[PDB]
Amino acid sequence: ENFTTNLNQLARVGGIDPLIGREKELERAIQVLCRRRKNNPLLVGESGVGKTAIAEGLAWRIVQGDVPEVMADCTIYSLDIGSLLAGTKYRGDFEKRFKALLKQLEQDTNSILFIDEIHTIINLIKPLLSSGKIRVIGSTTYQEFSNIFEKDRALARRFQKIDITEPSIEETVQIINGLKPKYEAHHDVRYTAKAVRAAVELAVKYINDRHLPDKAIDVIDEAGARARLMPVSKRKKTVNVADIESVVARIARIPEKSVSQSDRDTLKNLGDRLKMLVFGQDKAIEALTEAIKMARAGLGHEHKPVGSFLFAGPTGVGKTEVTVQLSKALGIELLRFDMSEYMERHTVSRLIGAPPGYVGFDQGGLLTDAVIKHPHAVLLLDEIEKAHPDVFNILLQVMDNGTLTDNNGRKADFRNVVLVMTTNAGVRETERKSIGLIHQDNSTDAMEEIKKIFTPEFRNRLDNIIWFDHLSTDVIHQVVDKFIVELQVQLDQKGVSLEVSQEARNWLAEKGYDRAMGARPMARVIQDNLKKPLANELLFGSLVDGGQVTVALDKEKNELTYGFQSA
Amino acid sequence: TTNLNQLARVGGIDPLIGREKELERAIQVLCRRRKNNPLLVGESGVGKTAIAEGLAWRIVQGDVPEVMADCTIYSLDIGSLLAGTKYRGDFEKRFKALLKQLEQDTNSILFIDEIHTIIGQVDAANLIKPLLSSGKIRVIGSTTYQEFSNIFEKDRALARRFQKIDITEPSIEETVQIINGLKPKYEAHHDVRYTAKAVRAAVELAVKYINDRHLPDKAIDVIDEAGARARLMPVSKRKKTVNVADIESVVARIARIPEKSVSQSDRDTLKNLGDRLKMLVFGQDKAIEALTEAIKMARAGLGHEHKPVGSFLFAGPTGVGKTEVTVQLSKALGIELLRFDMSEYMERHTVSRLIGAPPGLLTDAVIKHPHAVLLLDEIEKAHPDVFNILLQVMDNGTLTDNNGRKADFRNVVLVMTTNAGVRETERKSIGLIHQDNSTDAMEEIKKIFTPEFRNRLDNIIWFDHLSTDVIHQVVDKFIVELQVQLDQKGVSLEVSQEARNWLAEKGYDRAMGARPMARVIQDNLKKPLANELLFGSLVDGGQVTVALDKEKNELTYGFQS
Numbered sequence A: 001e002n003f004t005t006n007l008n009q010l011a012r013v014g015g016i017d018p019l020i021g022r023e024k025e026l027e028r029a030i031q032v033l034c035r036r037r038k039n040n041p042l043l044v045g046e047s048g049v050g051k052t053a054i055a056e057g058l059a060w061r062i063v064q065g066d067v068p069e070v071m072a073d074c075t076i077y078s079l080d081i082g083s084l085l086a087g088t089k090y091r092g093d094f095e096k097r098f099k100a101l102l103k104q105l106e107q108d109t110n111s112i113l114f115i116d117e118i119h120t121i122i123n124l125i126k127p128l129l130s131s132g133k134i135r136v137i138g139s140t141t142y143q144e145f146s147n148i149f150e151k152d153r154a155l156a157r158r159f160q161k162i163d164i165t166e167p168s169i170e171e172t173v174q175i176i177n178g179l180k181p182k183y184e185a186h187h188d189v190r191y192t193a194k195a196v197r198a199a200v201e202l203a204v205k206y207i208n209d210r211h212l213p214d215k216a217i218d219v220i221d222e223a224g225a226r227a228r229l230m231p232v233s234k235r236k237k238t239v240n241v242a243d244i245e246s247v248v249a250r251i252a253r254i255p256e257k258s259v260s261q262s263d264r265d266t267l268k269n270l271g272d273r274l275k276m277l278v279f280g281q282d283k284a285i286e287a288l289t290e291a292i293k294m295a296r297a298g299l300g301h302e303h304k305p306v307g308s309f310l311f312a313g314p315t316g317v318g319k320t321e322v323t324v325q326l327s328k329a330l331g332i333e334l335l336r337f338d339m340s341e342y343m344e345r346h347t348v349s350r351l352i353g354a355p356p357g358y359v360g361f362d363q364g365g366l367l368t369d370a371v372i373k374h375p376h377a378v379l380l381l382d383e384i385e386k387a388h389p390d391v392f393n394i395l396l397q398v399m400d401n402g403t404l405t406d407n408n409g410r411k412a413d414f415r416n417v418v419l420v421m422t423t424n425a426g427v428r429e430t431e432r433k434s435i436g437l438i439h440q441d442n443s444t445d446a447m448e449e450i451k452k453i454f455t456p457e458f459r460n461r462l463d464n465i466i467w468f469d470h471l472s473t474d475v476i477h478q479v480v481d482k483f484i485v486e487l488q489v490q491l492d493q494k495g496v497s498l499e500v501s502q503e504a505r506n507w508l509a510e511k512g513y514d515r516a517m518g519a520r521p522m523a524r525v526i527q528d529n530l531k532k533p534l535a536n537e538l539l540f541g542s543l544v545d546g547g548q549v550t551v552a553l554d555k556e557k558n559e560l561t562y563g564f565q566s567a
Numbered sequence B: 001t002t003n004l005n006q007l008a009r010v011g012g013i014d015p016l017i018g019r020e021k022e023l024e025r026a027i028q029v030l031c032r033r034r035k036n037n038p039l040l041v042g043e044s045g046v047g048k049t050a051i052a053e054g055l056a057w058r059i060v061q062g063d064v065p066e067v068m069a070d071c072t073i074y075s076l077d078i079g080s081l082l083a084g085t086k087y088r089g090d091f092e093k094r095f096k097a098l099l100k101q102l103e104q105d106t107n108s109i110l111f112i113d114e115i116h117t118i119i120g121q122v123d124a125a126n127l128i129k130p131l132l133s134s135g136k137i138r139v140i141g142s143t144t145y146q147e148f149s150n151i152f153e154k155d156r157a158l159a160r161r162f163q164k165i166d167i168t169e170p171s172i173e174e175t176v177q178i179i180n181g182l183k184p185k186y187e188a189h190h191d192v193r194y195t196a197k198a199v200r201a202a203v204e205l206a207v208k209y210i211n212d213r214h215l216p217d218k219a220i221d222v223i224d225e226a227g228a229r230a231r232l233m234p235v236s237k238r239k240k241t242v243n244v245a246d247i248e249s250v251v252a253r254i255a256r257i258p259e260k261s262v263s264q265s266d267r268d269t270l271k272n273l274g275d276r277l278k279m280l281v282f283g284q285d286k287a288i289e290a291l292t293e294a295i296k297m298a299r300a301g302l303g304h305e306h307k308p309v310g311s312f313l314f315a316g317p318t319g320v321g322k323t324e325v326t327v328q329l330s331k332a333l334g335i336e337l338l339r340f341d342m343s344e345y346m347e348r349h350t351v352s353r354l355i356g357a358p359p360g361l362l363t364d365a366v367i368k369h370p371h372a373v374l375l376l377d378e379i380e381k382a383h384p385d386v387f388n389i390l391l392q393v394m395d396n397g398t399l400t401d402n403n404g405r406k407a408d409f410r411n412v413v414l415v416m417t418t419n420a421g422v423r424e425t426e427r428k429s430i431g432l433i434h435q436d437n438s439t440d441a442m443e444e445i446k447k448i449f450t451p452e453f454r455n456r457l458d459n460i461i462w463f464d465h466l467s468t469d470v471i472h473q474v475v476d477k478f479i480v481e482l483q484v485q486l487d488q489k490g491v492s493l494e495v496s497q498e499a500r501n502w503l504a505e506k507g508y509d510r511a512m513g514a515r516p517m518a519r520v521i522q523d524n525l526k527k528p529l530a531n532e533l534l535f536g537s538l539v540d541g542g543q544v545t546v547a548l549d550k551e552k553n554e555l556t557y558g559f560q561s
């Protein structure tokens, strides 16, 4: 009694919440219990799916009487793992306590024991099952079932697998609606029907953390607590959809704008936002917006991925910038996998294999699990030309069916992820000089390179070939100013003030920036040129105090001249 | 047990400052129908207990919501039952009655400090709370992150009833305010007076040199230590004035840092060091210049403060002393040397030792020696998994082992030595006239290492083949090394100028660097002397001079005693 509480008796007095739905799942649980042998139900599931609640809901049904006569008198007791284990801290002392508890249940016929999180415990579990005097309910995670139940033949034979699947979107809101009267009575304030339905959709799309149904129940209670606690509750007797989103911000860790509904609103601002931080190449961003626009409208196959993008040109063509901004604008975690490392059998196995350890089974496919970890996260691929043709074939499979299957058996859905690729074929051909007495430009069309490097089917499945325009000199000058501004703000904290001449910015721009390497060398060029000379003075010299710095160039020698003042 | 609300009126609890974000989140979860019991998990020494007490004080103040007002916070001592109720059966009488007292008052709240002890007499406390509470009784639990995993994950019942709310680290400005509030107690205890400016500097200085503890604990310790230091350490006048100079001695002893490290008067050491390291290693002036330049930049220019002060990669031909630079760098800089051999870390199973306890080292070394030079020799040998640890260490600047303690990598300087550069096209061109061959820059280094990891490295330093002139300088170093060894036996070695040139050219190999130079000197100088020392006049110690004869172009050894 003390070690294990009585759920059936508890439900008779109250506390247990009535279970709505799950009629088919509960029906099967009743069926196995009525069996002469192998009558130990196993509510396999995931955290938050309601498997524990199903046990509590089953106990309520028995007292209510919605069960066969044989099961009407049965009593479900939930074994407390913490109570028995706590206070002993010894091997075999815990078992002695379990023997006494088991004896009490064995003495009383038609007694049901519920071992929540049974995998944690799993010596005495096998004997009670083999005897068959008392049937036992066990809740274990799907991952733990394979690790423990499947490996042990005896445990698997006695326990019957009952598949507990998460309810659909419509089902999840219905569960909240069924349980909404209880909540409203508890705090005396109600939620609008639009708000509860919206909570399910907004929670899963942004938080993506515990469970589809669990997040809905947790998000509704969190919203009511904030609104009721606030003094405005007297004036505000209903919960607005935005109010939940504002409360959801606390458990989101992102601004309210991201949580705010932007299915159609993001389209207009996202186009402007890309241009706000990126100068020029409006056509390139328009191609990206057009492909994702199709998914929001919804006039497409559900399995087909959200969007397909492509990038060409030299390294550092804003692939990281546009992707980071695109991910930020869409409020999706940025996931980037580099094909540059996938050039060997061991490395190429990484997409669907577990390079960290063969013993390790949880990670499985690193690229595949990344999608599973974040359903909406964007996938950024770079230097795909390097990768072997065989690896590229698997990409074609997911693009067609919009789904993948891991070696471990996990299934990943690409219906919610946009796939973008980056290619740098142009730099290799253009830099080469023609083999002739008089040289000729070796620049070639980017589309030509995509066709030769990749198979025709890839282009056919791909919605369109997107070529990003090359960087402009005006942008490079602005980029130089940004780095100086970044360096400038860093110096202001220490108390040093740096002033750079306009001619100095142009001077660094010509030598630093390269056509083949884009803006990558300019970044490095600004660090060594400016940080190194001041660094010596900052430690010891004129810049130790005051921090007065001037930057200028000498036209006669074409070398930068640095002036240091003690100040 | 005691009533914090009544204690607030007495004034025992100091006024809460800051923590608005945590308090706002804490009060809402408390009101929730489910997970009504807040769980204030926090890092060690983060002031989790103190902020919880502050919440009780806020109730009387009325800053909290009107509904929350009148809530009666309570605090129960664990030792009151572990020690007081030695007998069996008395425990149930006290908690059943206590829980009844908590009950009959809806606003009543409890605060069980160190909740990990409560769950894991201990067992009865865990079970008794949920069975009869039925959500009527609300409680607050404080525990460490390490302890939190041991209890929260093992028992799912607590998790459904408890909402984990993290405790943020207070700002330095926030921390100094706490010291001012508690300053009268510390001053009265040691009869010392603390300067307001110096107290603020103590918080800044404490974080700069002490990182194992958190901001509140380290700030409290330095201030309290200063009172004891001023109380007894100054023999002259037993002055009560506490200046930043005095606190420097306090942090100096506590942080195991040398006197004048606080002064920062090491610019001359770094300034002269430009050629001190180059004096010991010849032919790597360009390589060392870049290395020293980066160190100078990192010390003055913080750049990314979160990342380690220095990240370097040494690649080049064999015998160029790439590893030599690392060992000498620690001596010239004066920092301790930490050496790890990745050859032992060849397999994947063994790397678990590198990060934490074995399933069923880097972090431990760093905490023990924050100021150190982590020489990850033969880095290429280890599996790519290690690169992930280095990647996390470089970007985040901290690593967590199985114990979960945080290691400070900002002070330590990470360096590695790779042997990819040894590969060279030794074979000469197929022609009457030989043609120089240049290897592709970092071709092997680029392929072997991942691009993101390589980009994080500040500079992939290279090492050029030792020049013939440079090799001559190395000969002098080995001669001096032989000379000091012979000093113990008593022999004095003199080497002719012409002898040095002959030895240098015979042992000058670009691919092998300076390694063959040791062998030629060993065969030409150490081997003859050994026979003479064991079976000659040199046994008792005598002058020896070596000079080559032009006619036969071979060294001649003369022994005297």
Ligand SMILES: Nc1ncnc2c1ncn2[C@@H]1O[C@H](COP(=O)(O)OP(=O)(O)OP(O)(O)=S)[C@@H](O)[C@H]1O
Pocket: B280, B281, B282, B283, B284, B317, B318, B319, B320, B321, B322, B323, B324, B325, B419, B466, B474, B513, B514, B515, B518
């Ligand atoms: N450039 C150098 N300057 C001074 N001594 C050197 C130099 N290169 C090698 N040595 C000597 O060689 C020994 C140390 O060599 P190491 O530092 O192990 O060389 P290394 O090139 O790192 O070796 P590998 O390539 O890893 S086998 C000591 O006796 C040094 O004095």
Ligand SMILES: Nc1ncnc2c1ncn2[C@@H]1O[C@H](COP(=O)(O)OP(=O)(O)O)[C@@H](O)[C@H]1O
Pocket: A017, A018, A019, A020, A021, A022, A046, A047, A048, A049, A050, A051, A052, A053, A054, A167, A175, A213, A214, A217, B156, B160
């Ligand atoms: N289908 C469902 N019907 C009713 N409540 C559900 C359902 N699924 C989940 N819940 C809710 O899940 C909450 C926690 O129970 P459960 O998810 O079984 O816990 P656990 O995650 O520990 O297995 C309960 O408060 C319950 O109301």
Ligand SMILES: Nc1ncnc2c1ncn2[C@@H]1O[C@H](COP(=O)(O)OP(=O)(O)O)[C@@H](O)[C@H]1O
Pocket: B014, B015, B016, B017, B043, B044, B045, B046, B047, B048, B049, B050, B051, B054, B178, B181, B182, B216, B220
């Ligand atoms: N707002 C505050 N007012 C007063 N003291 C505070 C405040 N915040 C933190 N403290 C201090 O925090 C300390 C409590 O640390 P504690 O939580 O017991 O550490 P640990 O978790 O390592 O055992 C005390 O010195 C206390 O005075």
Ligand SMILES: [Mg+2]
Pocket: B322, B323, B377, B417
């Ligand atoms: Mg070496």
